[PDB]
From Swiss-Prot, chain A:
<dbReference type="GO" id="GO:0002076">
    <property type="term" value="P:osteoblast development"/>
</dbReference>
<keyword id="KW-0336">GPI-anchor</keyword>
<dbReference type="GO" id="GO:0048471">
    <property type="term" value="C:perinuclear region of cytoplasm"/>
</dbReference>
<comment type="subunit">
    <text>Interacts with PRIMA1. The interaction with PRIMA1 is required to anchor it to the basal lamina of cells and organize into tetramers. Isoform H generates GPI-anchored dimers; disulfide linked. Isoform T generates multiple structures, ranging from monomers and dimers to collagen-tailed and hydrophobic-tailed forms, in which catalytic tetramers are associated with anchoring proteins that attach them to the basal lamina or to cell membranes.</text>
</comment>
<dbReference type="GO" id="GO:0007399">
    <property type="term" value="P:nervous system development"/>
</dbReference>
<feature type="binding site">
    <location>
        <position position="438"/>
    </location>
    <ligand>
        <name>huprine W</name>
    </ligand>
</feature>
<dbReference type="GO" id="GO:0003990">
    <property type="term" value="F:acetylcholinesterase activity"/>
</dbReference>
<dbReference type="InterPro" id="IPR029058">
    <property type="entry name" value="AB_hydrolase_fold"/>
</dbReference>
<dbReference type="GO" id="GO:0001507">
    <property type="term" value="P:acetylcholine catabolic process in synaptic cleft"/>
</dbReference>
<feature type="binding site">
    <location>
        <position position="83"/>
    </location>
    <ligand>
        <name>huperzine A</name>
    </ligand>
</feature>
<dbReference type="GO" id="GO:0098552">
    <property type="term" value="C:side of membrane"/>
</dbReference>
<dbReference type="GO" id="GO:0043083">
    <property type="term" value="C:synaptic cleft"/>
</dbReference>
<keyword id="KW-0095">Blood group antigen</keyword>
<feature type="binding site">
    <location>
        <position position="200"/>
    </location>
    <ligand>
        <name>huprine W</name>
    </ligand>
</feature>
<dbReference type="GO" id="GO:0045202">
    <property type="term" value="C:synapse"/>
</dbReference>
<dbReference type="InterPro" id="IPR000997">
    <property type="entry name" value="Cholinesterase"/>
</dbReference>
<keyword id="KW-0472">Membrane</keyword>
Length: 533, 538
């Protein structure tokens, strides 16, 4: 019998599994329950801590995926299927996973906690691309990831009601972080060194824990990959949240908040999933119906307000974007776009694309967008229009919110490191015109190219090892730089003035200035003034 | 006794002129021909009355008086400013025009160039040295005409609806002179069927207004707009704002002893000494500005049936040829006239707060939101506080808003709606230029080359500049003759392509051969011409 795979946590006993990597074994405890199953009367409610169990919980395999829509845009295509549920769906989905070195560390090891993205309507900690075994073996960290409720189950809100208060998916994440404080030492993890990292909605989540005092004592450093809590898709106001909840109810044949939630609770989960898409007020390339609500509780103000008011001395943050944030999203509803052709769009398609990529702004606002993103020496060139609409979508939803977060945090005491990830994977299944799309740095951060069964180049493996080192250096010390490595070119901090970041690719680090500074001045400085007056 | 070449009879009577020496040979000049009754006394603010016929011979032998105007004193004695100041005495008795013609008089009808000076509708004169028509006439054998027209309150004070100060009488001065050319230019050997207007700044805006006013449009055939457009934001005013300005001027000079009967008010304005009106005209502007233009053409349904912007958009311009352009640094000259931090005598390396303040004075009368948009577009957000860059950007702001983008818009619409259009950017800095080097090629400093002033032996231009001057005179007179500036039958010479709304091609005018380029500040002017007006509506 293997004692390394037996662990006792506060709730009871667990049996793990030994995993192989090209670099040696790793211990994994997959499918650890951290909440009571949020089912029946507990749907829409805050998570309750998992009650103690007798006997030994089997933690040798990933547990169920939280209920969510399954993307069928390109059935069987790797580029979309790699994000889809790879376990059965269930509301009984509140489990987390721990990877640790083998044999288990006997002194406190830094902890990385992964929060997946997926627009708050999808995702799972069990996706292959979030496999913690390579990071843990290579960099000797403990790695934790949790499932949290998404869609209506995580973020349906009737603000003010006890029956559906909203943000319970974020509370799922917080409960997992509390679980890590209480239990990670039993795995050799150090609860006093916890680094949160997340991508997209995962990054927005990390940002929200930064801005919510009860979460802030549960970790020490933060990594935000291609997402920010101040992204225009990441939150919703109380009034609009109530409207969307009410629309969902009507669409599933339900009619007083108590009566409305009770009716919603009688519906099969799959039925809520089936209707969640058409509660949105405007058509969009984004499928984001239920998201965190600003209601004074989890978030006492908008993330923008909270960010401007905040004292961030003592914080270190690693943030960045991929080279082409907008391109991936354009095939989910921008007219003229497909992964299977060149998507050379016309100016009419461009104008249409703008209304879909930048939903819910005024005509005046949209005009200003078309102004700033047209090359007036080539206003109708299809390739330039394709690139420009990609820019519009990426700038608005990802790059400029991250740049704004970076600048404010740095000016208010945080130490910030910024990157742009610029390597197109040799294995990438999306067409060449999409460049380095959203989501495709993750496989490199998690060291997936080390997996011999996959087909990355030797150069790509060394690159992955570099990225894993940057990330783990940051988790250990707040600084990704090779602690003492004199003659390696250094990653300087990002500042509101000099705005320096590094390019992450197969070449040595190159320092540059400005995260699309000209474009983000538009989104971050001018457009808010417009939507006012 | 008398020289027959210097004698001409026009509809009003007989004229005697003068034989002018030029480096290339003699020219006949008839300077100071009266074309209207003096707009004196009861005739102040009224439309011009045609000059009554006279017996005997009028000596048209020297420039007549400059129309009353403010005299610039910012840099006293400095050439860069004094070259624009009156060089004859001020008088309300100023409605005279000038004809230059080859010596001997042409024997077959000759293309006529008609010059309209700039000066913001508050200043200027046809007698300035830099507008001397003798070099063009000698070198290109055209007939050249220029006129004085009333400026300031005397030409553009308007109490819309009133018969006593209807407004736009300065433009009517120009029109009357154009009618005079139709009726009389043949007597000098000029061709009334080939008349090309040209003008710079307010003169270019006047040229454009004649394009857009049907009773003027019949009096000429082609047009040249140098650094100005009728759709310029400084170039017209609405009826109510014109009346407000007129009324405030009246008030400030004690009339009446505000508003009331227009007849009474104007009668009281007519008793004030000219100089008193001039001394107070700076007071009537609603905002502090670097374009101190108190009285300007008024959009009132008469001379202009609609805004020039609207008239441009709605117009059929088939059969028209037009030549338009700008200098390289349109904005710099205006900044030393009041933008905080600026001086011709230092480098004008301004702060960000000075830049922000400059935007308000260089783009007056726009909302805070609009000013924000301007700061956004013109800040380099990787270098938001670099003084040199801020100086350059403010110069671009002022130039783009007031000159380049109105010209680009005029050019694109005319081209798209039937006109043949040629566009240039003037990029040569005169070896003789007295403004500092940071100003680059400032507003107004192409004019001396177009008029061939470097050929004046008393001046000290380089030989290359004399050659350059001759090239420009050739383009302008080619255009006047044929509607096309290109050398008819010359092929190894670089060609000047027409400007169109799509390709937006123009040429650079400098010591080097023509270089063809694309877009008149196209990214910048998309902001001024396409977006910013939409922000006005919302
Ligand atoms: C590029 O493809 C898009 C998407 O169309 C689909 O994908 C193609 C690869 C092909 O399989 C098509 O048959 C599919 O319909 C094209 O945009 C479509 O254009 C057609 C034209 O009639 C229109 O009916 C669809 O609604 C369009 N789809 C969207 C999402 O707008 C686009 O025309 C292609 N580009 C080309 C052909 O140059
Ligand atoms: C650049 O010059 C301006 C203009 O000031 C005048 O011209 C200068 C060349 C020099 O002779 C000054 O003494 C003159 O007053 C300067 O702006 C002025 O600054 C003074 C004092 O700081 C102030 O009282 C005025 O109001 C300013 N005028 C304007 C229009 O802003 C400017 O500071 C000079 N820059 C330098 C010297 O670096
Ligand atoms: C202004 O006063 C004049 C002067 O007597 C007179 O003709 C008339 O009543 C007034 N004009 C108008 C238009 O009312």
């Amino acid at each position: 019998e293997d004692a390394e795979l037996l662990v006792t946590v506060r709730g009871g006993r667990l049996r793990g599994i030994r995993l192989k990597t090209p670099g040696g074994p790793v211990s994994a405890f997959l499918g650890i329950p951290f909440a009571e199953p949020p089912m029946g009367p507990r749907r829409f409610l805050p998570p309750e801590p998992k009650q103690p169990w007798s006997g030994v919980v089997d933690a040798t395999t990933f547990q169920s995926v939280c209920y969510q829509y399954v993307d069928t845009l390109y059935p069987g295509f790797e580029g979309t299927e790699m994000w889809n549920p790879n376990r059965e769906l269930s509301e009984d989905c509140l489990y987390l996973n721990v990877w640790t070195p083998y044999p288990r560390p006997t002194s406190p090891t830094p902890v990385l906690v992964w929060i997946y993205g997926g627009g708050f309507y999808s995702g799972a900690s069990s996706l292959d691309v979030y496999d913690g075994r390579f990071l843990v073996q290579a960099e000797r960290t403990v790695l934790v990831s949790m499932n949290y409720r998404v869609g209506a189950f995580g973020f349906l809100a009737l603000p003010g009601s006890r029956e559906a208060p909203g943000n319970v998916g974020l509370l799922d994440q917080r409960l997992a972080l509390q679980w890590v404080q209480e239990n990670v030492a039993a795995f050799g993890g150090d609860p006093t060194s916890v680094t949160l990292f997340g991508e997209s909605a995962g990054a927005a989540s990390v940002g929200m824990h930064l801005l919510s005092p009860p979460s802030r004592g549960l970790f020490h450093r933060a990594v935000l990959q291609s997402g920010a809590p101040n992204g225009p898709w990441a939150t919703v106001g109380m009034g609009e949240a109530r409207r969307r909840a009410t629309q969902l109810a009507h669409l599933v044949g339900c009619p007083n908040d108590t009566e409305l939630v009770a009716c919603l609770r009688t519906r099969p989960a799959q039925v809520l999933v089936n209707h969640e898409w058409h509660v949105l007020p405007q058509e969009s390339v984004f499928r984001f119906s239920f998201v965190p609500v600003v209601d004074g509780d989890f978030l006492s103000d908008t993330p923008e307000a909270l960010i401007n008011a905040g004292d961030f001395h003592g914080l270190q943050v690693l943030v960045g974007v991929v080279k082409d944030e907008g391109s991936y999203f354009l095939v989910y509803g921008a007219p003229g776009f497909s992964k299977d052709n060149e998507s050379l769009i016309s100016r009419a398609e461009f104008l249409a694309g703008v209304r879909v990529g930048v939903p819910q702004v005024s005509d005046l606002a949209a005009e200003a967008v078309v102004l700033h993103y047209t090359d007036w020496l080539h206003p109708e060139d299809p390739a330039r229009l394709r690139e420009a609409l990609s820019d519009v979508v990426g700038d608005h939803n990802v790059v400029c919110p991250v740049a704004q977060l970076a600048g404010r945090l740095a000016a208010q005491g945080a130490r910030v490191y910024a990157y742009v990830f610029e390597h197109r994977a040799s294995t990438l299944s999306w067409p060449l015109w999409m460049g380095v799309p959203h989501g495709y740095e993750i496989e490199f951060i998690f060291g997936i190219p080390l997996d011999p069964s996959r087909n990355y180049t030797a150069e790509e493996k060394i690159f992955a090892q570099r990225l894993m080192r940057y990330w783990a250096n940051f988790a250990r010390t707040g600084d990704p730089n090779e602690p003492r490595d004199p003659k390696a070119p250094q990653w300087p901090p990002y500042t509101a003035g000099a705005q320096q970041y590094v390019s992450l690719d197969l070449r040595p680090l190159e320092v540059r200035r400005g995260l699309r500074a000209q474009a983000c001045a538009f989104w971050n400085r001018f457009l808010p003034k417009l939507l006012s007056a």
